[PDB]
Design a protein around this ligand. Structure first.
Ligand SMILES: *[C@@H]1O[C@H](CO)[C@@H](O[C@@H]2O[C@H](CO)[C@@H](O[C@@H]3O[C@H](CO)[C@@H](O)[C@H](O[C@H]4O[C@H](CO)[C@@H](O)[C@H](O)[C@@H]4O)[C@@H]3O)[C@H](O)[C@H]2NC(C)=O)[C@H](O)[C@H]1NC(C)=O
Ligand SMILES: *[C@@H]1O[C@H](CO)[C@@H](O[C@@H]2O[C@H](CO)[C@@H](O[C@@H]3O[C@H](CO)[C@@H](O)[C@H](O[C@H]4O[C@H](CO)[C@@H](O)[C@H](O)[C@@H]4O)[C@@H]3O)[C@H](O)[C@H]2NC(C)=O)[C@H](O)[C@H]1NC(C)=O
Ligand SMILES: *[C@@H]1O[C@H](CO)[C@@H](O[C@@H]2O[C@H](CO)[C@@H](O)[C@H](O)[C@H]2NC(C)=O)[C@H](O)[C@H]1NC(C)=O
Ligand SMILES: *[C@@H]1O[C@H](CO)[C@@H](O)[C@H](O)[C@H]1NC(C)=O
Ligand SMILES: *[C@@H]1O[C@H](CO)[C@@H](O)[C@H](O)[C@H]1NC(C)=O
Ligand SMILES: *[C@@H]1O[C@H](CO)[C@@H](O)[C@H](O)[C@H]1NC(C)=O
Ligand SMILES: *[C@@H]1O[C@H](CO)[C@@H](O)[C@H](O)[C@H]1NC(C)=O
Ligand SMILES: *[C@@H]1O[C@H](CO)[C@@H](O)[C@H](O)[C@H]1NC(C)=O
Ligand SMILES: *[C@@H]1O[C@H](CO)[C@@H](O)[C@H](O)[C@H]1NC(C)=O
Ligand SMILES: *[C@@H]1O[C@H](CO)[C@@H](O)[C@H](O)[C@H]1NC(C)=O
Ligand SMILES: *[C@@H]1O[C@H](CO)[C@@H](O)[C@H](O)[C@H]1NC(C)=O
Ligand SMILES: *[C@@H]1O[C@H](CO)[C@@H](O)[C@H](O)[C@H]1NC(C)=O
Ligand SMILES: *[C@@H]1O[C@H](CO)[C@@H](O)[C@H](O)[C@H]1NC(C)=O
Ligand SMILES: *[C@@H]1O[C@H](CO)[C@@H](O)[C@H](O)[C@H]1NC(C)=O
Ligand SMILES: *[C@@H]1O[C@H](CO)[C@@H](O)[C@H](O)[C@H]1NC(C)=O
Ligand SMILES: *[C@@H]1O[C@H](CO)[C@@H](O)[C@H](O)[C@H]1NC(C)=O
Ligand SMILES: *[C@@H]1O[C@H](CO)[C@@H](O)[C@H](O)[C@H]1NC(C)=O
Ligand SMILES: *[C@@H]1O[C@H](CO)[C@@H](O)[C@H](O)[C@H]1NC(C)=O
Ligand SMILES: *[C@@H]1O[C@H](CO)[C@@H](O)[C@H](O)[C@H]1NC(C)=O
Ligand SMILES: *[C@@H]1O[C@H](CO)[C@@H](O)[C@H](O)[C@H]1NC(C)=O
Ligand SMILES: *[C@@H]1O[C@H](CO)[C@@H](O)[C@H](O)[C@H]1NC(C)=O
Ligand SMILES: *[C@@H]1O[C@H](CO)[C@@H](O)[C@H](O)[C@H]1NC(C)=O
Ligand SMILES: *[C@@H]1O[C@H](CO)[C@@H](O)[C@H](O)[C@H]1NC(C)=O
Ligand SMILES: *[C@@H]1O[C@H](CO)[C@@H](O)[C@H](O)[C@H]1NC(C)=O
Ligand SMILES: *[C@@H]1O[C@H](CO)[C@@H](O)[C@H](O)[C@H]1NC(C)=O
Ligand SMILES: *[C@@H]1O[C@H](CO)[C@@H](O)[C@H](O)[C@H]1NC(C)=O
Ligand SMILES: *[C@@H]1O[C@H](CO)[C@@H](O)[C@H](O)[C@H]1NC(C)=O
Ligand SMILES: *[C@@H]1O[C@H](CO)[C@@H](O)[C@H](O)[C@H]1NC(C)=O
Lengths: 106, 122, 438, 106, 432, 126, 123
């Protein structure tokens, strides 16, 4: 399954609500995860199962979507949330990732 | 020899073919076969459930802790195993079959399993 | 110190009434819906097992009868209906090379029926048997019961040839077969075997004479529900077959007349050559030897100095007064008065039976349903053997007993085959005392 | 077009003799050969299909074998009913072709 | 010494044929959709054969059964096999359409069983045949039972997922180069197939799956001239099909609540139905097909495309259902090239209302007219081609008509297996 | 999900695949249109019960791995334990042993449990 | 007490009537529904028996395991479970943890345990 993530050049202020979306070339039910990668750092898993949040991740992050249409919503984009976000499916082998959305500070 | 081949044999000799009979219990013109298949399965499962609740699951010959009551049959072993068939026995004790089953349910599972449940701590 | 020991797989059974299915090695009986048979059927002798059999209460007969009725109905259900033919017919006599006996038997009937288009009508003709036509009143005729029964045309592509049906028990059940060569239908059977399925029983539908099927192993068997009750039928099973050669000598054609969108009515068209009466032949010596055997067996119940008389049917439905059968799709009604006409007093050549043919028949005596048998092209010859009789006694208590042919209840035909079988259920679980303690 | 050479073109045998007819093809037909018996004035009767499968209604006297480009029809005992022209046919593609035909006479 | 050890839950399976059930999201199927999830079978190489795949025969049987159970309760057009008095429609007719539509008058039975009424309808030339005079009848109305489709039942294909009964599994071939037969080194186990659209078409495969990498040429025996070649595209070719006429629906009551839906009249100009494909895209697609065909027929072999040699209308033209109307498009403009080692192509299309689908004897369906103007866009995802056969030049023509070859073009990567959970193996473990 | 991991070990060695016996076990049981569904459901039930009956007859009821008293015959397979458990998968093994599977099953019934139960009947007797 | 008579009883008292409920799990229009009811009853019975088999609990109504109780599933003491609670209340309490427990029963025993018995019976 190929994953397309957009927008690739999102920018926002430290107080804005943002939404990053992606599309699967095939329906994958809810077999999707979202990751956060700081420059020079290990990616962190934020969301699994499309709608489920990991322990250690604040309620600020929320996932939604099913089938082919998925999104990640950040209710308030604090300074620690400017990172490359990735869309990843595990519905069919091999695992695949989207190209990533780099969230910039205006 | 063969399915029900021992039906005319004595109970002792007939007890050696339990797999011969057991293996033949599971295996217009469309719905009759589906009902026949479902019936065979339900009868099989009712007998397996009885074996389960008596602590006899997975066995064709199962020893119990229920004593034999002479009121059910006062014959000795020679006249049951060597000089009698299973059809005759089934006829002779049909009136007591449910009594025996009740006793098997009570002492071979309800009491025995709680005793085993307690012996697993002490 | 005896203890209850539970045994599973015990060779014990009880009488049971269950659903049986079929096996067989298109046709009316939808035999393609049957499972494959065992390439090497396993008949297992139950040595030292004596079972009580009763062919008169055998539930396999009622179940087979029900199956035959249901198969018949689903076979005819998708076939062309003949309601457009319940119209006034204008009929004249066929006079083309007709014999003295075939005078009035076949009528050349014209009628107005629709054609390829719904508005266009054509005058069409068919040759119908006298028995299929009833006068309306002047040459105006109608098909028999065309307004009181729904006549369904049989599909010409669905064969009426009996195909053996093997009745098979559900798992957990078994069929017990009686191997006693002298078994008379009721009581203990000291030689019993268990089978997976019955032998192949052909669903042959006939009256008076049992055609094809099983023969007695040693001698003619006289089986009755109550031999002293003259209202019961007597099933006579032959030990030797009697060959009966039946024919429909006319060379028939089939005239296919459009009746609906892609639907045709198949009329008898014209007859090629001359018109002669259908008939059946049996050898006089074979038949007389067979009756001598039947009489010798009847005297075992009636007295060694009693005169045994055979006579024809006293009356009733055509299917009962005559020998009804089906050869190649044609339905024959043969006059057996030449077969049951003798007096046996205690102390080469052939018999020709005239036969009538019908196209509109009502099998299983159902109200509001009838079938039209489509014509069979060419000339029909079939050779069947008689394996038994259905007889009825006059009684009326005299030193003489009179036996007449009977029939019409097809259960008796199935019963004549399903007499050595009973269905039992297996009771594999049981208990017995042993000295073994858990 | 796949060409078919059938040999002998004419064979003389009496009743009870063993008759073998060989059909050689110009290309491999993958065991897609049929054998036919043509009596004068009649359409050919199928004897054998798919190299060796006997047609129901044909007596066991007729048998066939072969593979690749070389196939044989064997008549174990030539009877009075078995005289006529024998043809081989290939159905491996299009066009369907027939051999020249071997006439079996007395 | 070694002893027999019995294992239950062994991951072993044998090829099997079993009845499959359908997941969806009709009433003959299971609702709530299948789970897409698949389990990858690492190091499992499984032999597949798309031409021996029993799933195709069941899908074909089930599609026919669903069709028959969809038309059964609909109005049967039996009182319409009457003489028609047909004249040509001359109202705003273009050169192409002269004689294609006729205005046919007939006497139809009204709701009262003792009364008749005179009604008229427009019919396509292909749906009526002469009696000898202006007298015409509906084609094959006396040799087949024509059943009117219910106008409220759509013919739009909806994806159907085929699912294994418990105890069985569906193995999917993930090898992007899998050619329909032989070992597949990358296999996964699924409970249900992907959503397969029951698209009915000939010559061109519409709304199907695309090749993952490059155009695939699949044939049972590529060297057997009599077999079909299924060409799976790696890019879609868009085809825009239309029925430009603005038609009305004339409801004629024929029975106790049973209506015949006739073409009433046409508003405005009468123009032929047609389909457009981009000429450049089609030429690029055929260049890819030729590139792949030369891998089997030779690098120096000339690949020629030609139109169908003949046969039923359903196979000489591109047959498809566009918005409820049945189009028969002339593809001679698409398969007309010789390949030696922007603009559009317009395909005229005929339309029929009396459809004999699956080529059965004694059955036909009447497609009610669709009101307004029809315009559908489909993706061509493959071809069904045949070779002419018997040097240096090969000719390929459109084929089809057997819908199994369409289902087979989707059900090529799947096989059904039976799970064999019991097994025995030597170990040193001894009982007691 | 119950389906997760189903047949994942199919390409694994027999030893490694023997650690997943519950994964492939838990997925074995769960108008003519209606009749076709009932036949599929009944068949799944019948196949489950036939395999459980065989386990009962062999004295392996309720077990995923069951040890027996039937010696392994080198005529069935002469491979050693490394070749079978470490260098082979269960599909390859099944292909090799399918010719001897009915012989082995016959021995599992005839050569042990019928004799073992009749002997256990006599050991609990004393 | 008959079928489900112990439903309002405490878990302890209710555990002595398990056979009462166990005996009642197996036993055009009105014909089809009867067959569907029979097939459904068989499938659900066998689903429970399959789980008992996988956990090593085949043939038993009370089955002890090698899986320790995790206090996060419930931190109640035995006197507050067996003596002062019903099975309906317990089922309400253990809902989110049923699949975790079943997975642990499947993995920690009758899989690892059978391999261990396979090795122990080796010597
Ligand atoms: C008791 O058993 C005998 C022996 O089987 C049985 O007689 C047989 O009846 C069949 C049925 O007609 C005969 O077979 C037919 O022979 C004619 C010869 O002209 C053929 O034309 C028939 O073929 C047509 O019908 C077929 C139906 O399946 C079609 O498939 C076919 O295409 C033709 O349309 C058919 O083969 C058979 O010859 C006789 N046997 C003898 C020895 O006469 C008899 O009917 C049984 N008793 C009763 C009461 O039925
Ligand atoms: C291949 O795939 C294409 C792409 O999806 C597909 O084209 C689509 O077909 C559908 C179905 O015909 C079209 O939807 C129709 O649009 C017309 C436009 O007016 C509507 O009138 C239709 O509504 C009818 O049905 C409704 C049911 O509720 C009624 O309420 C209504 O009154 C009408 O009767 C219907 O919505 C769709 O527009 C096209 N899309 C494109 C881009 O072409 C095509 O059919 C597929 N082909 C095959 C052979 O599978
Ligand atoms: C698939 O096959 C590979 C290759 O044999 C298996 O891994 C090798 O073998 C064992 C583990 O099985 C290791 O000791 C080796 O280091 C592995 N080498 C390589 C290159 O992989 C692997 O286990 C198999 N996987 C499955 C799921 O069956
Ligand atoms: C039948 O009875 C005889 C006489 O007792 C005995 O020898 C024989 O073994 C018995 N056979 C069976 C199968 O019961
Ligand atoms: C045996 O049964 C009788 C009644 O049938 C009963 O009165 C008696 O107490 C029973 N004895 C034993 C030891 O079970
Ligand atoms: C058991 O009782 C019977 C009385 O029918 C007697 O003949 C037989 O010898 C007894 N058996 C034993 C072993 O004492
Ligand atoms: C008639 O009976 C004889 C027994 O001698 C048998 O060989 C023959 O097949 C029977 N005929 C039919 C039609 O069954
Ligand atoms: C059948 O045999 C039984 C044997 O008990 C006998 O009583 C009965 O009278 C016989 N019936 C006929 C009709 O021969
Ligand atoms: C019956 O016998 C007569 C002898 O008079 C013979 O001519 C006729 O052909 C026979 N018919 C049949 C059907 O055997
Ligand atoms: C029946 O009568 C019609 C005319 O009424 C005639 O044309 C036809 O030849 C007759 N057919 C026969 C068989 O007598
Ligand atoms: C019936 O016909 C056959 C030849 O078809 C003949 O051999 C036999 O003797 C005939 N039987 C009778 C009773 O006429
Ligand atoms: C019976 O035979 C008599 C002559 O003995 C005859 O008058 C009568 O019509 C016949 N009845 C039947 C039904 O054959
Ligand atoms: C019965 O037989 C007598 C001779 O005993 C004969 O005269 C008479 O015609 C026969 N009747 C029938 C109906 O065959
Ligand atoms: C019926 O007559 C036709 C006349 O053409 C002939 O060809 C055919 O062989 C005859 N059929 C029979 C069964 O005599
Ligand atoms: C067709 O003919 C009818 C008369 O039957 C007429 O009223 C109608 O206008 C005509 N329609 C067309 C399109 O010619
Ligand atoms: C498909 O691939 C197999 C690989 O074994 C090859 O033998 C076969 O010829 C190929 N068929 C086609 C049509 O490409
Ligand atoms: C096809 O292309 C022609 C170009 O002249 C255009 O007029 C027509 O409208 C097009 N039709 C469709 C359905 O795209
Ligand atoms: C079909 O329609 C689309 C959208 O209206 C248009 O962009 C395209 O050019 C048309 N032609 C083809 C061949 O797709
Ligand atoms: C195929 O093309 C030829 C011209 O090469 C044409 O005459 C013929 O009508 C075409 N046939 C079809 C079915 O398009
Ligand atoms: C085929 O192409 C030629 C030019 O190569 C052209 O003249 C001819 O009209 C085309 N035919 C069709 C049916 O498109
Ligand atoms: C068709 O013609 C009618 C005439 O009343 C018009 O209202 C409608 O908009 C037209 N529809 C189309 C799709 O051309
Ligand atoms: C065809 O494929 C294209 C790929 O870009 C896609 O956008 C489109 O939705 C598909 N369907 C149609 C009807 O074009
Ligand atoms: C092993 O099997 C062979 C036949 O395959 C047999 O002859 C031999 O006796 C068997 N040996 C053992 C020890 O089972
Ligand atoms: C098992 O056999 C193989 C032969 O393939 C051999 O290489 C290996 O050393 C053997 N191992 C043992 C433990 O016998
Ligand atoms: C199994 O036996 C068949 C013959 O029945 C033989 O062809 C095959 O090679 C054998 N396979 C094995 C693995 O022994
Ligand atoms: C209901 O509660 C009372 C005490 O409040 C108790 O005595 C009784 O046994 C309970 N009922 C059941 C069925 O346990
Ligand atoms: C169990 O815990 C409860 C809750 O704190 C407590 O009230 C009760 O006394 C405890 N009982 C025992 C036996 O520990
Ligand atoms: C499961 O968790 C939810 C909150 O996510 C809670 O409301 C519910 O009570 C829990 N289930 C129990 C305690 O059985």
């Amino acid at each position: 399954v190929q994953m397309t993530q957009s927008p690739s050049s999102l920018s926002a202020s430290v107080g804005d609500k943002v939404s990053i979306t992606c599309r699967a070339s095939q329906g994958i039910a809810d077999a999707l995860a979202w990751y956060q990668q700081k420059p020079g750092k290990a990616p962190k898993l934020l969301i699994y199962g499309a709608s489920n949040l990991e322990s250690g991740v604040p309620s600020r992050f929320s996932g939604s979507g099913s089938g082919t249409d998925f999104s990640l919503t950040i209710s308030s984009l604090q300074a620690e949330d400017f990172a490359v976000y990735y869309c990843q499916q595990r519905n069919s082998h091999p695992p695949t990732f989207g190209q990533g959305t780099r969230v910039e500070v205006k | 020899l063969g399915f029900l081949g021992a039906a005319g044999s004595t109970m002792g000799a007939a007890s050696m073919t339990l797999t011969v009979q057991a293996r033949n219990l599971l295996s217009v013109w469309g719905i009759k076969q589906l009902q026949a298949r479902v019936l065979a399965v339900e009868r099989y499962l009712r007998d397996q459930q009885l074996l389960g609740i008596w602590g006899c699951s997975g066995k064709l010959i199962c020893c119990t802790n229920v004593p034999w009551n002479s009121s059910w049959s006062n014959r000795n072993l020679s006249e049951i195993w060597d000089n009698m068939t299973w059809l005759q026995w089934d006829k002779e004790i049909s009136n007591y079959t449910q009594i025996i089953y009740g006793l098997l349910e009570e002492s071979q599972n309800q009491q025995e399993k709680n005793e085993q449940d307690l012996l697993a701590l002490d | 110190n005896l203890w209850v020991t539970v045994y599973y797989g015990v060779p014990v059974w009880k009488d049971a009434e269950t659903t049986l299915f079929c096996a067989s090695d298109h046709n009316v009986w939808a035999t393609h819906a049957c499972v494959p048979t065992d390439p090497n059927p396993q008949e297992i002798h139950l040595e030292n097992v004596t079972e009580e059999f009763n062919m008169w209460k055998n539930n396999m007969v009622e179940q087979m009868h029900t199956d035959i009725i249901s198969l018949w109905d689903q076979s005819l259900k998708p076939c062309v209906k003949l309601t457009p033919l319940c119209v006034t017919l204008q009929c004249t006599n066929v006079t083309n090379n007709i014999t003295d006996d075939m005078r009035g038997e076949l009528k050349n009937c014209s009628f107005n029926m629709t054609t390829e288009l719904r508005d266009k009508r054509q005058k069409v003709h068919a040759l119908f048997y006298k028995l299929d036509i009833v006068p309306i009143n002047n040459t105006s005729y109608r098909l028999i019961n065309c307004n009181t029964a729904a006549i369904t045309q049989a599909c010409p592509k669905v064969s009426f040839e009996p195909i053996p049906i093997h009745y098979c028990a559900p798992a957990g059940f078994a069929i017990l077969k009686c191997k006693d060569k002298k078994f008379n239908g009721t009581g203990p059977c000291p030689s019993v075997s268990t089978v997976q399925c019955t032998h192949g029983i052909k669903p042959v539908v006939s009256t008076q004479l049992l055609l094809n099927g099983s023969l007695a192993e040693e001698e003619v068997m006289i089986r009755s529900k109550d031999i002293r009750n003259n209202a019961k039928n007597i099933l006579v099973q032959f030990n030797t077959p009697v060959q009966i050669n039946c024919t429909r000598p006319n060379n028939n054609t089939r005239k296919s007349i459009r009746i609906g969108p892609g639907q045709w009515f198949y009329a008898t068209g014209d007859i090629i050559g001359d018109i002669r009466q259908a008939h059946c032949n049996v050898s006089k010596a074979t038949w007389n030897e067979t009756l001598g055997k039947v009489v010798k067996q009847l005297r075992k119940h009636f007295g060694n100095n009693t005169i045994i008389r055979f006579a024809n049917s006293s009356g009733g439905d055509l299917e009962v007064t005559t020998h009804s059968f089906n050869c190649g799709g044609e339905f024959f009604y043969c006059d057996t008065s030449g077969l049951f006409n003798s007096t046996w007093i205690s102390n080469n050549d052939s018999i020709t039976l005239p036969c009538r043919i019908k196209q509109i028949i009502n099998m299983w005596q159902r109200i509001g349903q009838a079938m039209y048998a489509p014509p069979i092209q060419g000339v029909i010859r079939c050779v069947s053997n008689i394996t038994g009789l259905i007889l009825t006694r006059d009684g009326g208590s005299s030193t003489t007993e009179t036996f007449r042919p009977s029939g019409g209840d097809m259960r008796d035909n199935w019963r004549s085959e399903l007499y050595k079988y009973k269905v039992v259920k297996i009771e594999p679980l049981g208990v017995a005392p042993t000295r073994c303690k858990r | 077009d796949i060409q078919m050479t059938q040999s002998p073109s004419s064979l003389s045998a009496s009743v009870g003799d063993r008759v073998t007819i060989t059909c050689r093809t110009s290309e491999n037909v993958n065991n897609c050969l049929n054998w036919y018996q043509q009596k004068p004035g009649k359409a050919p009767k199928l004897l054998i299909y798919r190299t060796s499968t006997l047609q129901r209604g044909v007596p066991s006297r007729f048998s066939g074998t072969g593979s690749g480009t070389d196939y044989t029809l064997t008549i174990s005992s030539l009877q009075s009913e078995d005289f006529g022209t024998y043809y081989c046919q290939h159905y491996y593609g299009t066009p369907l072709t027939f051999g020249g035909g071997t006439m079996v006479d007395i």
